[PDB]
Amino acid sequence: TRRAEVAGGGFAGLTAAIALKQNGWDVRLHEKSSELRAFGAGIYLWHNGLRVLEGLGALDDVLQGSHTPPTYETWMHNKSVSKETFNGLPWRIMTRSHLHDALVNRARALGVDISVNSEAVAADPVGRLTLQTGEVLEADLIVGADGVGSKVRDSIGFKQDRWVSKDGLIRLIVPRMKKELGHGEWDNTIDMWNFWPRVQRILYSPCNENELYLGLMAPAADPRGSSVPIDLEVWVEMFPFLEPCLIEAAKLKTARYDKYETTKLDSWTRGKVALVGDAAHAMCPALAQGAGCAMVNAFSLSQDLEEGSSVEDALVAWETRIRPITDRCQALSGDYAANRSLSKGNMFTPAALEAARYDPLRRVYSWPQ
């Protein structure tokens, strides 16, 4: 009976744990936090990620209570510039905790051993995981899913391309306030861009009949637009049609202005150690594939470990097989971000939807564009 130690309780670690447990592995997941939770307010999942949920036996709990907008619409200075539906390509919007809970309940129903207040501080390719307390654990597989700043990764030393975004955003969950919004298509995802009179953007994303996921984006150099709690006035001014929701968002005293970083490594494996999720490939959010690829990769890792080969060879086989999809997605998303391509609309092209089109279960590309 094989034993795996997963460091990190995020979407990647939870995905890895569940997939491994389903294949007969004895698995223990380590979460440094005192409780299992997810941050970031809301999240978009596509066909590729939805398929992972199916393979994990956690799709039903996710679909129930999540939302698929009639269309993905883009605005530039309040003028609708595009409405995209991706030719039937499945996608979904939900609060992060809704997705996190589905994964945690499944992990528990499976008998995955989850340890809170357990922080991994080092990993040995020979198959050993060291915790912050000094306690050393041995296993046949060590999974580094501890996000950006991954101690598992840095304890081993990987060649890393790092970049940090100077600009960030404020992500919040507020009431739909649908009736107060009056006439409109308020069930759609609406990416509201603006460069004049100021650079302010709001990604409007309904999660269900009760919750709305908002992303208020302004330059870090904007003292008003980047402030938290939100400077109500500055947002209502350029997004008056959302005052009802903005008024509610202004009451959230814990809102935060988050920046992000991207990560590209020369490799994702070392001996019996495999890096997954942000720890291995954090990317720009343009294509909304950060978690999608993380879940695909974590799930794919379990598949390669079912070939009858050594864990070491399975890991290199895993990277070689699945990595290209993430590299291209990460590269394209970076290009979109730098050129602000999404502001033009109709940018979810076949190339952009490549990762989303991938079906990890059958290991083929579906929903052609």
| Contacting positions for ligand FAD (CB under 6 A) | 7-13, 30-33, 40, 43-45, 119-120, 145-147, 151, 169, 260, 277-279, 285, 288-292, 294
Q: Does 285 bind ligand 3HM (CB under 6 A)?
A: yes
Q: Which is nearer to ligand 3HM, 203 or 218 (CB)?
A: 203
Closest Cα partner for 189 from 68, 367, 287, 76?
68
The continuous run of DSSP H or E covering 312 comes out as: helix 311-338
Q: Which is nearer to ligand FAD, 31 or 73 (CB)?
A: 31
Residue with tokens 């899913």: 145
CA-CA distance, 210 to 276, in Å (whole number)? Answer: 33
Q: Which is nearer to ligand 3HM, 151 or 201 (CB)?
A: 201
How near is the Cβ of 318 to ligand FAD at its closest, in Å?
Answer: 16
Site residues (CB under 6 A) for ligand 3HM, limited to 121-180? none
Q: Does 356 bind ligand 3HM (CB under 6 A)?
A: no
Say if residue 223 is preceded by a cis peptide, omega within 30 of 0: no
- How far is the first Cα of the chain from the last one, in angstroms, to the nearest whole number? 43
| Full DSSP string of 136-166 | EEE-SEEEE---TT-HHHHHH---EEEEE-S
Site residues (CB under 6 A) for ligand 3HM, limited to 305-344? 342
Residue 194 DSSP symbol: -
Q: What is the three-class DSSP state of 107? A: helix
Give the one residue of 215, 225, 277, 345 binding ligand 3HM; rule: CB under 6 A: 215
| Full DSSP string of 10-33 | SHHHHHHHHHHHHTT-EEEEEESS
Specify the stretch interacting with ligand 3HM by CB under 6 A; choose among 9-17, 238-246, 284-292, 296-304.
284-292
How near is the Cβ of 308 to ligand FAD at its closest, in Å?
Answer: 28
Query: Which of the choices ligand FAD, ligand 3HM, none does residue 69 contact, using the CB cut-off of 5 to 8 A by kind?
Result: none
**Pairing of β 113-116 and β 160-164:** unpaired
Residues 10-49, one symbol each (x = binds ligand 3HM by CB under 6 A, - = not), give ----------------------------------x-----
* Binding positions for ligand 3HM, rule: CB under 6 A: 44, 203, 215, 285-286, 288, 342
